[PDB]
Structures are given as structure tokens and as C-alpha cells.
Write a protein that binds this ligand. Structure first.
Ligand SMILES: Cc1cc2nc3c(=O)[nH]c(=O)nc-3n(C[C@H](O)[C@H](O)[C@H](O)COP(=O)(O)OP(=O)(O)OC[C@H]3O[C@@H](n4cnc5c(N)ncnc54)[C@H](O)[C@@H]3O)c2cc1C
Ligand SMILES: Cc1cc2nc3c(=O)[nH]c(=O)nc-3n(C[C@H](O)[C@H](O)[C@H](O)COP(=O)(O)OP(=O)(O)OC[C@H]3O[C@@H](n4cnc5c(N)ncnc54)[C@H](O)[C@@H]3O)c2cc1C
Ligand code: NA
Ligand code: NA
Lengths: 126, 126
């Protein structure tokens, strides 16, 4: 039931893959995504078309769950998602990603931002 | 947009962690779980108390997403979840898990079963 803000941040900076949970009606949908943790927020680059985007336009309340090694730590982030229009925020977040992953989603894409309303972390046995 | 039933099965047998997506109202909740793929279904052992179980009793329509290495493969499973009362199905599934993970959730637990109504797989670049 962890609460060490530096450990979590380190984890959120290193973790490669996160799982975005959406729902319209009572029908959940969970997809893996590359992401960066920046500001007090999760950003990812994504095609601005698809099931994920229909659901978001319908219901921007989302969940983002990350879980990995360095016993297992898992973080869950609740908040609301929205596409980024701020050019510089958008550009920072993109550079932050290349730096993270590299130190076609093709036609029409955008940067998306989940504002961290609530966050919970846990360390787990097996 | 893969469709090789043997490759997927091999993947579902080996993958360590899955992500269970639930919703009540328009509020998603995603948690990581140990699991086995058996029958045409996902089973896991879990405490029969907690947020996960309140939501399930309210809305048994769920999503289960698995994503890992052996380029990246990701599988999404849609279906309905329910606790297992069948003693032998329950016992097979439990043995299947020990064999998978080992070849406190404490008080009150159960085996849960997501019946695979629909399944989709994908292989991904980065
Ligand atoms: C490790 C990894 C990293 C990824 N990183 C990113 C990224 O940063 N940005 C990004 O946009 N995408 C990323 N993806 C793919 C991401 O899941 C896509 O956005 C998603 O696959 C397509 O989204 P959609 O809802 O618009 O798809 P749609 O094409 O509209 O999906 C419709 C149907 O296709 C199936 N489906 C969709 N996605 C998947 C999936 N991933 N696996 C199995 N079935 C699926 C579902 O059954 C769904 O109902 C990554 C995937 C992996 C595995
Ligand atoms: C890799 C790994 C494997 C796991 N395998 C299993 C397993 O097979 N069976 C099992 O029951 N559990 C497993 N867990 C833990 C699983 O997530 C628990 O069921 C869950 O953590 C508690 O479920 P709940 O909704 O009843 O929790 P509750 O205690 O009722 O949760 C209430 C609040 O706690 C927070 N929270 C709950 N779970 C997590 C979490 N995992 N990470 C961060 N915050 C959380 C959320 O903010 C939530 O709103 C595993 C976890 C990890 C990381
Ligand atoms: Na993972
Ligand atoms: Na994973």
C-alpha cells in the first residue's frame, strides 16, 4: 500500500508499457500503450481514429495502470483524458518520449493527456 | 491483426500477468492479475472482497488484456466473469496455476472465470 513519491516517480519514468482502461455503457476496453509521465500526467501519442477515440469522446473518465519489476510494483492512475492542442506541451511530451524509447499509427494522430486526479501504488509479493 | 490459433495459445500459456478491466457507471478500473488460460477461458484466484468484487457484482461484463514479448503480441479478451463453484473445474484451474507459476489474499477467496466470448490478437512494431 506504498506511498514513497520518489520511488513511484522513478518507476513511472522507467516502466515501458501502460494499460489504458475505458468504458462506454458498462463495457470495458483495455489497451496497452507507450507513454511518458510528465507534469502530474500521462501522455501518449495515438491515432486520432479508432475504438479508443469513439469511447473517449463518449466518456473521458479513464484508468491507467502500470505494473512491473523494480517484488512487483503497480500504479493505478484515475483521471480524465483529453487531446493536447498546446503546441509546446505537445512538443515537450513528444521529445520526452523519444528520449525514453529511443535514446505509422499513420494518417491522423494526436497527443493525449490523462490528468492525474487520483493515483494509488502498491508493492506485491507474487 | 493476427489469427494463428496456436501462436496465441502458446502466448496465453506463457504470459505471466494480465490486466482486468471493469466498469461501474462510466468509471473504469484496471488491475493486474496472475492467471491461467484453460478451457476457452481465463481463471484467476482472488480475494472475494474488495473494489473488484463490488464492481463485478454490479457489472460482470469485463475485459482481459495481455501483452508481452515472444516484436510485441497483445491479446484482448471480452466476456463475462463469474465465481467458480464447480469443485473440480476449480481444482484443475488451481493446479494449472501452481504448475505455471511455481514449477495471503487472505481471509475469503474464490476462483474467478472469464468466459471468452470474443478474443482479438495483434502483433506490434514498437
Ligand atoms: C506494447 C505495445 C505498445 C503500444 N504502444 C502504442 C502507442 O503508444 N500508441 C498507440 O496508439 N497504440 C499503441 N499500441 C497499440 C494500441 O493498443 C493501439 O492504439 C490499439 O492497438 C489500437 O487502438 P484502437 O482502439 O483505436 O484500435 P481499433 O483498431 O479501433 O480496435 C478495434 C478492435 O481491435 C481489437 N484491438 C485493438 N487494439 C488491440 C490490441 N492492442 N491488441 C489486441 N486487439 C486489439 C479490439 O478487439 C477492438 O475491439 C501498443 C501496443 C503494444 C502491444
Ligand atoms: C504482478 C501482480 C500480480 C498480481 N496477481 C494477483 C492475483 O493473481 N490475484 C489477486 O487477487 N490480486 C493479484 N494482484 C493484486 C491485484 O491487483 C489485487 O486483486 C488488487 O491489487 C486488489 O484488488 P481490489 O480491487 O479488491 O483492491 P481494493 O483493496 O478493494 O482496492 C481499492 C483501491 O486500492 C487501489 N488498488 C487496488 N489494487 C491496486 C493495485 N494492484 N495497484 C495499485 N493500486 C491498487 C485502487 O486505487 C483502488 O481504488 C497482483 C498484482 C501484481 C502487481
Ligand atoms: Na507489464
Ligand atoms: Na506486461
Amino acid at each position: 500500500e506504498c506511498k514513497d513519491e520518489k520511488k513511484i516517480t522513478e518507476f513511472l519514468n522507467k516502466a515501458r508499457t501502460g494499460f489504458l482502461g475505458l468504458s462506454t455503457n458498462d463495457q470495458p476496453y483495455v489497451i496497452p500503450l507507450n507513454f511518458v509521465w510528465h507534469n502530474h500526467a500521462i501522455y501518449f501519442h495515438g491515432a486520432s481514429e479508432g475504438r479508443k477515440i469513439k469511447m473517449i469522446e463518449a466518456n473521458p473518465e479513464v484508468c491507467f495502470t502500470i505494473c512491473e519489476d523494480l517484488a512487483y510494483m503497480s500504479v493505478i492512475i484515475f483521471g480524465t483524458i483529453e487531446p493536447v492542442s498546446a503546441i509546446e506541451e505537445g512538443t515537450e511530451a513528444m521529445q520526452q518520449m523519444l528520449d525514453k524509447y529511443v535514446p505509422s499509427l499513420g494518417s491522423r494522430t494526436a497527443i493525449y493527456k490523462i490528468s492525474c486526479r487520483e493515483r494509488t501504488a502498491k508493492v506485491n509479493e507474487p
